[PDB]
């Protein structure tokens, strides 16, 4: 469990450093991953960027699956996103660095993403809808973008208890 930096901290604005080839498969890289999962499981989030705990590395984790749009548990390093078409889809987002709030954000509906897993094996997936949304959201942290900077319709930005009574 680690401190989630909250919006306004200048560490969330960094352009993150690539993970060095040298740490691929290293113990230090494992501790970080473990902390990130423990921290994300504890505050009940769907995803987490290393910069959100003030670690300046292109490293994100995400994964959603319970009684019900599932997303596989993934550890993506040094990622790179390619939109597959011009189609956009609005949907609800929150974030642990912006507690108390939700916003509607329009994202690419279909992406390819590529990167490395923690042992340096390449990742290369084509995804749509929610899975595509989460990856776009987490990769924004690595270029110092939080989701309010992405909102086009501020009629749908507000406090969670006000937008969602239940």
Residues annotated as part of the active site: 138
Binding segment (CB under 5 A) for Ni ion, from list 15-23, 35-43, 59-67, 149-157 = 15-23
CA atoms within 13 A on the CB side of 136: 26
Q: Which residues contact 63 (CB under 8 A, 6 or more apart)?
A: 46, 47, 71, 72, 73, 74
Q: Which residue in 77, 84, 88 sits closest to 114, CA to CA?
A: 77
Contact letters for Ni ion, residues 47-86 (x by CB under 5 A): ----------------------------------------
Chain residue whose CB lies nearest Ni ion = 95
Q: Does 20 bind Ni ion (CB under 5 A)?
A: yes
Q: Does 19 bind Ni ion (CB under 5 A)?
A: no
Binding segment (CB under 5 A) for Ni ion, from list 18-26, 60-68, 109-117, 124-132 = 18-26
Q: Which residue in 34, 10, 6 sits closest to 144, CA to CA?
A: 10
User: In whole angstroms, what is the distance from residue 116 CA to residue 135 CA?
Assistant: 14
Q: What is the three-class DSSP state of 21? A: helix
Q: Does 95 bind Ni ion (CB under 5 A)?
A: yes
Q: Are 46 and 91 in contact (CB under 8 A)?
A: no
Task: Kindly determine how many residues on this chain lie close enough to bind Ni ion according to the rule CB under 5 A.
Answer: 2
Report in angstroms how near the CB of residue 127 gets to Ni ion at its nearest. 18
Nearer to Ni ion, 85 or 149 (CB): 149
Note the residues at the interface with Ni ion (CB under 5 A): 20, 95
């Amino acid at each position: 469990i680690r401190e989630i930096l909250k919006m306004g901290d200048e560490r969330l604005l960094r352009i993150a450093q690539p993970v060095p080839s040298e740490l691929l498969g290293s113990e230090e890289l494992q501790r970080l991953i473990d902390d990130m999962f423990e921290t994300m499981h504890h505050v009940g989030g769907v995803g987490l960027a290393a910069p959100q705990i003030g670690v300046d590395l292109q490293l994100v984790i995400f994964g959603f699956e319970r009684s019900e749009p599932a997303v596989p548990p993934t550890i993506l390093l040094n990622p790179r996103i390619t939109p597959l078409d011009d189609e956009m889809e609005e949907g609800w987002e929150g974030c642990l660095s912006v507690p108390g709030l939700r916003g509607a954000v329009s994202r690419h509906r279909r992406i390819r993403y590529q990167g490395l897993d923690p042992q340096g094996q390449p990742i290369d997936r084509s995804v749509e809808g929610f899975h595509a949304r989460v990856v776009q959201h987490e990769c924004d942290h690595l270029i110092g973008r939080l989701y309010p900077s992405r909102i086009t319709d501020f009629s749908k930005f507000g406090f969670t208890e006000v937008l969602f009574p239940d």
